[PDB]
Amino acid sequence: YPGADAETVQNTVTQVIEQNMNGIDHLMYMSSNGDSTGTATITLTFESGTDPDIAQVQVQNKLALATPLLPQEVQQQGISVEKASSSFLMVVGVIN
Amino acid sequence: MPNFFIDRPIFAWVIAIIIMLAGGLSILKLPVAQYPTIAPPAISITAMYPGADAETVQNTVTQVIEQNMNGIDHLMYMSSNGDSTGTATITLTFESGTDPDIAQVQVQNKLALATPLLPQEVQQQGISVEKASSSFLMVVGVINTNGTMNQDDISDYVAANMKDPISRTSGVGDVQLFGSQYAMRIWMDPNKLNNFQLTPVDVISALKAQNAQVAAGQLGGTPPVKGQQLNASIIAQTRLTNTEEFGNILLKVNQDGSQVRLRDVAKIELGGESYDVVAKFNGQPASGLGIKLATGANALDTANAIRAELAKMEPFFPSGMKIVYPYDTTPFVKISIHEVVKTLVEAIILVFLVMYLFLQNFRATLIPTIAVPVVLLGTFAVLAAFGFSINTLTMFGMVLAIGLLVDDAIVVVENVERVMAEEGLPPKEATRKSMGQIQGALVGIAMVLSAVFIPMAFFGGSTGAIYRQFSITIVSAMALSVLVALILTPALCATMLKPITGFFGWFNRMFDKSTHHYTDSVGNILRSTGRYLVLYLIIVVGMAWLFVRLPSSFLPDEDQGVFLSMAQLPAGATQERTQKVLDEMTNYYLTKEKDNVESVFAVNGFGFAGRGQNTGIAFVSLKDWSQRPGEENKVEAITARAMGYFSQIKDAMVFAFNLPAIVELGTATGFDFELIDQGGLGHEKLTQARNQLFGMVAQHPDVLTGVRPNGLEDTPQFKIDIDQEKAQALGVSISDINTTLGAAWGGSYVNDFIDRGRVKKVYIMSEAKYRMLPEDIGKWYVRGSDGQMVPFSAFSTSRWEYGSPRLERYNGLPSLEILGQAAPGKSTGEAMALMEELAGKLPSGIGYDWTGMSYQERLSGNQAPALYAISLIVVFLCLAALYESWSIPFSVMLVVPLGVVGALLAATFRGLTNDVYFQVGLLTTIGLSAKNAILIVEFAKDLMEKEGKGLIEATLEAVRMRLRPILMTSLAFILGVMPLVISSGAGSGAQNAVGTGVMGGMVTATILAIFFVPVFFVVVRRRFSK
Amino acid sequence: EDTPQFKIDIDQEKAQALGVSISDINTTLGAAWGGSYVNDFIDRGRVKKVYIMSEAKYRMLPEDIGKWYVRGSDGQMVPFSAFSTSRWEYGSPRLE
Amino acid sequence: GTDPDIAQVQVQNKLALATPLLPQEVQQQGISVEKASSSFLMVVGVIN
Amino acid sequence: LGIKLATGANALDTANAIRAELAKMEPFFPSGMKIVYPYDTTPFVKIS
Amino acid sequence: ERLSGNQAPALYAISLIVVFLCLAALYESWSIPFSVMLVVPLGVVGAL
Amino acid sequence: LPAGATQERTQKVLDEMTNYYLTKEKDNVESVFAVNGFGFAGRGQNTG
């Protein structure tokens, strides 16, 4: 949500998406945040053994219902759904 | 195996304990729902194009979406319709068993690719893809008692506060809000706009600018300057949030310098997104929440959680705002589950009582009491393993299977008791000898019942799913009953039973004399076997007569506590007239039926055939069943009385009806006929062909009855057509004219604004009084090139034309859905064939097709007889295997007509139909009668072989030994099913359908088999001897 | 933790008093201070972005706001000082 | 062994992020993400 | 129409479905029309 | 970690019950499993 | 770094950290890849 702050992002984007992203099968918890650059991140952790592909499909389905309620700028920018990990496998530094 | 566990009772107890633990854990972890997924997955696409008519919607939205629905797997058919409110609906029905999530995501992906082609207004509104085959667990209506705030305020309150807690409640898989949050509504005034020489184009342009977001950047952001110390984020927010701020928008500055603010040419206030629908609850403004149960969630727990949350939020509501529950399916589910559990417990108690009456000792009676619960718990564990739930179908499957379980336990225990009493053996040796007489029969019967029930699970469609629930439940129960009969009950008989005047003396003497008389009767019958084969043929002919003359059905209608009633005013009727009609309906319901009706949720501007201002609905909710005694207080009687009253309303076509048995599905009665346009003949030609077909079906009242459309007829419309020559001569752009007309009379969604931390729409539309009559077109002016104001009457012409308020398509072609049902006493197949024949005489370029229920009927009719043939062949092969002969099985397959006769007689006399419960009851009756015949024939054959007895002597001994367990099982099952037959309370339609057929079948089978099976055995043995 | 935020308020009434468009003000501020991604170009056979932004030394201090001029309706330049004011307020750079 | 449904879902999800950058003519014409190959199963000629 | 096969689909089932779909279209063809099949790879599978 | 700590006791209870049932089934008695199931506290004390 | 810190101060702190790792822990530490302006707790010029 370019040009927004944390409060506006939380009120108008993260809160709207969180409402619909709820009741998905094998959902265990979800934590979201929005920074001063206008970016909202919502992370949904599912039960162990859940199929990540079907989980992503359901997340996409629920999110698409929540899209028409967001600010038009968010629609223009686009919303990306992809499986997430926290820790790096490796870092490949390059020097001269 | 029985001999293995006769000497190892502890291992049998360990197995029983494992089964009990698995069943208890599964019961603790099984979902509870009224019904499972029956209807095929249907995904619905909804697109809103405000201010548009049916042709505009169909041409700009529905046609474009329908042309881009390629590469979606397992698609059965597709239908759509765009109504005059500006809403386009496209429904994609997929083959049964399709993954709903995959289907929905595929549809969404195709629509996301095909969205850039839609009008900017449709894209800005948003297109919704969602599952349409789901049903609402409950509807939570929120009303106002004081009468301070209208329904827009209530909808905003529920959206802002009540949606989040309800959505995050455990088990709530989806929450749908009936209504919408606020929206800044701007009501323009043409007189004032012309006063300052302005246009709705100018208001749209001056509203789009303000309330934008600026990426103001960052103070000291990278790449910095060497030595920077402070880094801060710049926040530039020129936002508008109040009505006063919106009224301060500047549109013009006159020559003298004065400023023309927005409030000078408009009335700005907070309103609703749309005003099409007005919902009331007993006459008060209301909103609502459509709560849908999740996947694998417990319905009762979810309902309790929702109620607890709503009660928690009660103290914080505004003044005089309360919660009401017009619709709720939890009380019915709870009553049904309790009734089934009570039936099972009563069946176990009755088994105990009959066992003590006949065997006369407590040690024997305790054994079935231990055996049957083990089988039930194992059945629950198996259901859990198969992904099933605890719903009406599986519960009634258990109730129907409670006959096989008690039959198995009774057979084993009674055989052991008879062996002990007659041969004077100890319990262990008597059990070992007894299990050697029936252990092969139990396996043969397991195979035979598997063959009888499994093929029923291979049907297709909605009926396929309904039959699969019953088939899996009953087959699992029977398999566990047979496994337990070979493992546990032999051990219990070996260890528990002890070696072997008054009322019991009298009963014993009476039963001994009865058995003597019965054996004498059978002996007399076997001397004239030829005479009684004619009686068997007469009975079979009567069975065929009753079966052909028995009306067919799908499921019995039930009193769920609620029913519907919808009005339909003539074409052109407005919202006030429909509200008057709905108020009359509500007054009738709350005055005449005050002792039956608890609330009326009158939804104005809504409908099922088609939305509009001239239609309405009322979800009448009745009181608790305990407050509605008698048949006069049920839903059917209330509906009939209302129909009697509503026929006098000479203002609308008001008629009430009950809900379907499965709301997920539709009526499921009659046929669904679509009249497609396969030659591009237009709407007029298609309507003429539909009228011609209606004229044709009117000539066959004996085959087709109640054939009617499922859509709205053509209605008058106001045609205003701009004149290009005059518009250009006066220097008026067509874009300006179209924007002015659309924004003034249909409304425009300009941009959004942030109020109380929520992004809310901004709408501009004319004030009500300036867009009501054809004479109001001349009140609106559009600015010319030179700055002069030109009225719509100087370059436009107006006339009244005709057009459809709701257009339809089927599989991408224009369509006209036609509904109806077959005349009494005629199968729906004949009505479908007649409709196909009559639709073939219609003009060239006009086709047809069958949708929904008719689709499923074709699919299942393609399957009906092959499964029966396979079942019969497999049963015959299993019986030939068991009896070691190709001819003996016919003495066991000829008992099938015996129980069916009784089932048909009971259904006919009681005036029931051939619904699904009837078929399942028939199958269980056939299975149990076949079990009895199998045991009789096997005992006779074993006597005739091992002990070298004669044919007649062996038959007589077999029937004498088998009489008692047959009577015990029949009495126990009949008594255990009698409450279902007599039940007439809540959800008693399914109970009666399940119980009456079973009771009649058991009565006739018990009376007839004991006298006919020996006849069949003797005749077959005589015929095929050498 | 909470960070200072340089809130700048645009007096629209004064903006039209001097004949300066709000759209022009927004575009000038965004492009000058936050940088604007205009379009792409081909660099050695790879598509890369084109960015426009103020030089570092002109977007550092709060008084650098008044160094930026926006053309009025009649073609006369107007500084941001003539139709805007700014203040410092605290806020959260990232809410959770 | 890859699931074609999930493969198409992921491909289209990644495409949805690049679509805003494409020209307007491309989007107006319409982008299609089919799960098929370069070879033809069959051809159905129609003549008068 | 050059028909391609969705990945993971059965060629013979798809060909049967297409040939059954066309049978619903022939009745409405304007006089002179005729469906001709100049290329098909499923008959080889069936006959082999 | 909280989930593991919460579900630890049920694991021990079900494991002990299953071992007792298996011993009773194998040894055809309710008393020999008891004689064998009283030795578990003698190993757990050592582990602790 | 404190709220409102700039890139230079974070880079100075990261340089201190790298110098410590490569001087005090030169026996155990082999390489330090200091990324300025990046973190797992949100982005910013005060983080590294």
Ligand SMILES: CCCCCCCCCCCCCCCCCCCCCCC(=O)O[C@H](COC(=O)CCCCCCCCCC)COP(=O)(O)OC[C@H](O)CO
């Ligand atoms: C202790 C635990 C025990 C648990 C046991 C549970 C077992 C339950 C398993 C049940 C699993 C079924 C799920 C399937 C669901 C998808 C079905 C798809 C529909 C199409 C099928 C039509 C068909 O395939 O149906 C005909 C096919 O055969 C048959 O039913 C087979 C009959 C099986 C007999 C079993 C006997 C076992 C005892 C032997 C000792 C073919 O005929 P068609 O119906 O296709 O059409 C006919 C027209 O000629 C053309 O239309």
